[PDB]
Design a protein around this nucleic acid. Structure first.
Ligand SMILES: Cc1cn([C@H]2C[C@H](O)[C@@H](COP(=O)(O)OP(=O)(O)OP(=O)(O)O)O2)c(=O)[nH]c1=O
Ligand SMILES: [Mg+2]
Ligand SMILES: [Mg+2]
Ligand SMILES: [Mg+2]
Ligand SMILES: [Mg+2]
Lengths: 414, 554
DNA sequence: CAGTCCCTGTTCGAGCGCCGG
DNA sequence: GCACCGGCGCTCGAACAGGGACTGT
């Protein structure tokens, strides 16, 4: 709806997104057609022809505590292509405070963008296409007229108005922290579990009051905490046990350079049978516990660098357990952690992977204000086929796939 | 009649001008036959005569049409296509008859002179200038530019399809129950109306299309049960493919094996059992398309086996959304799979084939899994849903696989079908080291400058063995040493290596491979009873590993 | 110890064909 | 001496990555 739009540039050297629309299920094409026919009548999107060379895929998800479908667009590409606009020109400050909070509620304030108009010279970049079941008709192309939900540039433009709406609430609640990441609003407090819930209720009202709708849940930062690398505690040690132990230690030495293995290798002199029991020597016993000591106190010299990318590797541990590590430069981890099976959901390794992905990303937003690039333990096709069945987030992070077997039953396990 | 629809605004890539390429000399038959096409279009206003103010030129030619008699004017815009702005292709795929639902009345129409009935952007008409040379080249030939959509330009299909959708948008509003499968100018219009009342909407649709410039000549399938649409023959109950003639010849060139695999693949759509892997092996080693290649023995068998599937009529039934979708998979040969999507026992919808060899070292399970995926993906494309699978694998085989594998894996709702050859895991390495089994420490090195190498083992009991190797690599030698440790051992072995690479291959439990060395290491592991494989860090003081390292150094 | 070579494994797009228009 | 666009298959080569050796000051 008309006022004054902001001139949005693309970096001279980069071209707009040109991504192919992947296949969608009937249940969700129908959903998209309805949402799009609605959104067009309202004037949010417009029909375009093939002379617009750009595309960005669309789909639909079904959020938790919702039976209504949500139109999600995979803007990942356009974001990479407009990062000077959203990171440099119009940055959104990240508070180091919500990490230190007790409870943080996330709010889907994405609805607010549909009021603000998008620059004409940019509407072209936000083009998408709905497919048709069994290719009855060619795809129906559309483009945004308003700010899009999924673009990292929408909150950037809305900052102006968002800070105004939020100021009277902040003036009387200076102790409460509000961070904005895309369609979401992270709101944290050092208050009581019950009093938090009502301040959130007041905030909802405050926004609903300023014209913005917002249709235990909430995150507990300090209830996550970094889990260490740990060595087993055997009563008696075998040849095999010592070798597996030496392996763990050898890779671990790439993280903590002070770990010595010498005396453990001294116990392994000559070709012994794998199940022969070797008792521990005086110095071997000292090196065991001394190495364990270095794995008790985490690696020093781990500083976030806001220009460098966040990287995350996940490991499938089996029986519903999944471990993760986030770093920027290898062996120098910023955060490490587990991921347990949620109560009531059916066992599907992909649901678990996607769930894990979303958790870690949320943590990464809350902690750093950025999303990580994921090194996923799954084959490309397997993921590309079922990830959208379990997705419930408004953002989508970067990912690559990796096949790497567990040589040393992953430093992370039992 | 040319369409009164608004033009799609076209631009040329920034800083580039239009084509100034000369017309090549043509055949007298073709030139004479192209003057008729151009005279017909001028009087109909489809092209326009241009004077000395148009510096552009592009060559034209003509191809014969599918049913002959009439020509097709083509323009070699390979040059303008380069200087023209990119488009976004609106055609996302080819419609499949297995996706069509059972209709009471059908009529498939084709729109004659399709592209030559849609306006071209008034501003862009200049670069679409061509030249028809005279009968014997006297003075200049007639010039001409386009006022309509040219056959051979990058922008043409996307603009036409898009222009066809805007044409059928008003008619569909007034007729929601009518299914118009539109692919270019080929409209399969199908309804649940009675034959008399159906034929009336078709005349309303015909008249609608003629108000829009789009003519439908009297070569529109009326009510003729053998409807030829999209390379198929559609009967009211069932559909089949159009006649597929596979050519028999004594000597074959590489261009022919390409043509045969492509034909065979097309026919995989509904003829179950098609195999191409051995025929496809003849395209290996690049070579010329003109060069003759001899048909090997295993490929002669396959072409004969495929010839046998083809001389039999097979049909596929249409879709019933009130009934659910079933997909079934069979193992063919090595790395080859066939599936079939049905709703009822002998009544198939579509059949298929999965033969991709992704990776150097895979297994049946891994392959069955990517087969399941290929279907799921294309099922969502045709019916908008995923099917229930009937798979040749045990619930317990699958369970041992996924719970033990390091990648995340999943196959949808499926049921075990007891149809041999079954998909199984041929071995399973031990979680813990075998007590009462000999421990084999293995390593194997190679000199990268002389291409020579050694590979061997040393055991706890005192057993030892090193072997010289000819044209090896450092990785092959470490693989050779696992092979040795497996030959010279009992039913129960314990092998300990310092190679990530090798162990990595074996941990993934391969049952096939591109490498013969790896193939026989598998053959050996299957022959065993209990095998425990483990890893150790290279240049550390691991007594056992250290001993073999020295031995393989010279 | 660091670059550097080789091996081996990937992923992408190109090229050819098939079918459709 | 020959156009376009789409989907699929199949092979090849480019580009890239990781590990183990090598070499070198
Ligand atoms: C098969 C084919 C189609 N096309 C496009 C352009 C045609 O206008 C359109 C439809 O092709 P056809 O319908 O096969 O040809 P047409 O409609 O122009 O004329 P008619 O009905 O008289 O056969 O498809 C090409 O550009 N080249 C081709 O070789
Ligand atoms: Mg036609
Ligand atoms: Mg046609
Ligand atoms: Mg060695
Ligand atoms: Mg060595």
């Amino acid at each position: 709806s008309p006022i004054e739009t902001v001139p949005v540039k693309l970096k001279p050297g980069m071209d707009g997104p040109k991504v192919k629309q992947w296949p969608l299920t009937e249940e969700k094409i129908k959903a998209l057609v309805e949402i799009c026919t609605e959104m067009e009548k309202e004037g949010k999107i417009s029909k375009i022809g093939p002379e617009n060379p750009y595309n960005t895929p669309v789909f639909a998800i079904k959020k938790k505590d919702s039976t209504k479908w949500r139109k999600l667009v995979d803007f990942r590409e356009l974001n990479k292509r407009t990062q000077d606009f959203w990171e440099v020109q119009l940055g959104i400050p990240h508070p180091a405070g919500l990490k230190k909070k007790k409870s943080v509620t996330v709010l889907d304030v994405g609805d607010a963008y549909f009021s603000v108009p998008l620059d004409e010279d940019f509407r072209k970049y936000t083009a998408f296409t709905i497919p048709s079941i069994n290719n009855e008709t060619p795809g129906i192309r559309y483009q945004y007229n308003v700010l899009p939900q999924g673009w990292k540039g929408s909150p950037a433009i809305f900052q102006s108005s968002m800070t105004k709406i939020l100021e009277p609430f902040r003036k009387q609640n200076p102790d409460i922290v509000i961070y904005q990441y895309m369609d979401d609003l992270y709101v944290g407090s050092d208050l009581e579990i019950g009093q938090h819930r009502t301040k959130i209720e007041e905030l909802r009202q405050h926004l609903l009051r300023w014209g913005l709708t917002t249709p235990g849940y909430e995150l507990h930062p300090d209830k996550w905490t970094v889990q260490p690398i740990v060595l087993p505690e055997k009563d008696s040690w075998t040849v095999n046990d010592i070798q597996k132990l030496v392996g763990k230690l050898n890779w671990a030495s790439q993280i903590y350079p002070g770990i010595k293995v010498r005396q453990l290798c001294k116990l392994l002199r000559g070709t012994k049978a794998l199940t022969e029991v070797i008792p521990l020597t005086e110095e071997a016993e000292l090196e065991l516990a001394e190495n364990r000591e270095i794995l008790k106190e985490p690696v020093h010299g781990v500083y976030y660098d806001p220009s460098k990318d966040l990287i995350a590797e996940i490991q499938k541990q089996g029986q519903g357990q999944w471990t993760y590590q986030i770093y920027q430069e290898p062996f120098k981890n910023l955060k490490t952690g587990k991921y347990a099976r949620m109560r009531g959901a059916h066992t599907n390794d992909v649901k678990q992977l996607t769930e894990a992905v979303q958790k870690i990303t949320t943590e990464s937003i809350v902690i750093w204000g950025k999303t990580p690039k994921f090194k996923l333990p799954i084959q490309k096709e397997t993921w590309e086929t079922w990830w959208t069945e379990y997705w419930q987030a408004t953002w989508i992070p970067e990912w690559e796939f990796v096949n790497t077997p567990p040589l040393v039953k992953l430093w992370y396990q039992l | 009649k040319i369409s009164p629809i608004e033009t799609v605004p076209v631009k040329l890539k920034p800083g580039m001008d239009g084509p100034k390429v000369k017309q090549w000399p043509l055949t007298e038959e073709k030139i004479k036959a192209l003057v008729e096409i151009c005279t017909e279009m001028e009087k109909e206003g489809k092209i326009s005569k241009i004077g000395p103010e148009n510096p552009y030129n592009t060559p034209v030619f003509a191809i014969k049409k599918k049913d002959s008699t009439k020509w097709r004017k083509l323009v070699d815009f390979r040059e303008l296509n380069k200087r023209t702005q990119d488009f976004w292709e609106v055609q996302l795929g080819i419609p499949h008859p297995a996706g069509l639902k059972k209709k009471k009345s059908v009529t498939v129409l084709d729109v004659g002179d399709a592209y030559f009935s849609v306006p071209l952007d008034e501003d862009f008409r200049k670069y679409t200038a061509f030249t028809i040379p005279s009968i014997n080249n006297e003075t200049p030939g007639i010039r001409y530019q386009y006022n309509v959509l040219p056959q051979g330009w990058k922008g043409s299909p996307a603009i036409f399809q898009s222009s066809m959708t805007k044409i059928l948008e008003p008619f569909r509003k007034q007729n929601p129950d009518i299914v118009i499968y539109q692919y270019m100018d080929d409209l399969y219009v199908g309804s649940d109306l009675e034959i008399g009342q159906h034929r009336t909407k078709i005349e309303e649709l015909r008249q609608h299309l003629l108000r829009w410039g789009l003519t439908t000549p009297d070569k529109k399938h009326q009510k003729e049960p053998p409807f030829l649409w999209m390379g198929y023959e559609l009967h009211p109950d069932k559909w089949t493919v159009q006649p597929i003639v596979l050519p028999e010849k004594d000597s074959w060139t590489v261009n022919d094996i390409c043509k045969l695999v492509g034909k065979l693949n097309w026919a995989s759509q509904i003829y179950p059992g098609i195999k191409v892997r051995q025929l496809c092996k003849l395209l290996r080693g690049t070579k010329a398309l003109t060069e003759v290649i001899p048909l090997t023995e295993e490929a002669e068998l396959e072409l004969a086996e495929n010839r046998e599937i083809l001389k039999e009529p097979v049909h596929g039934v249409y879709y019933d959304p009130s009934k659910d979708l079933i997909a079934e998979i069979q193992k063919q040969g090595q790395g080859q799979w066939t599936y079939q999507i049905y709703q009822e026992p002998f009544k198939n919808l579509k059949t298929g084939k999965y033969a991709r060899m992704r990776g150097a070292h895979t297994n049946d399970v891994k392959q069955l899994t990517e087969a399941v995926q290929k279907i799921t993906t294309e099922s969502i494309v045709i019916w908008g849903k995923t099917p229930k699978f009937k798979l040749p694998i045990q619930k317990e085989t699958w369970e041992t696989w996924w719970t033990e594998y390091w990648q995340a894996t999943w196959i949808p709702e499926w049921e075990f079908v007891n149809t041999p050859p079954l998909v199984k895991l041929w071995y399973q390495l031990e979680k813990e080291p075998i007590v009462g089994a000999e421990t084999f420490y293995v390593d194997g090195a190679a000199n990268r400058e002389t291409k020579l190498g050694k590979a061997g083992y040393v055991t706890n009991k005192g057993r030892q063995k090193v072997v010289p190797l000819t044209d090896t690599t450092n990785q092959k030698t470490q693989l050779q040493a696992i092979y040795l440790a497996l030959q010279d051992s009992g039913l129960e072995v314990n092998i300990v290596t310092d190679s990530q690479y090798a162990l990595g291959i074996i941990q993934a439990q391969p049952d096939e491979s591109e490498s013969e060395l790896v193939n026989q290491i598998i053959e050996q592991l299957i022959k065993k009873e209990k095998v425990y494989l483990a890893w150790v860090p290279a240049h550390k003081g691991i007594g056992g590993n250290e001993q073999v390292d020295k031995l393989v150094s010279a």
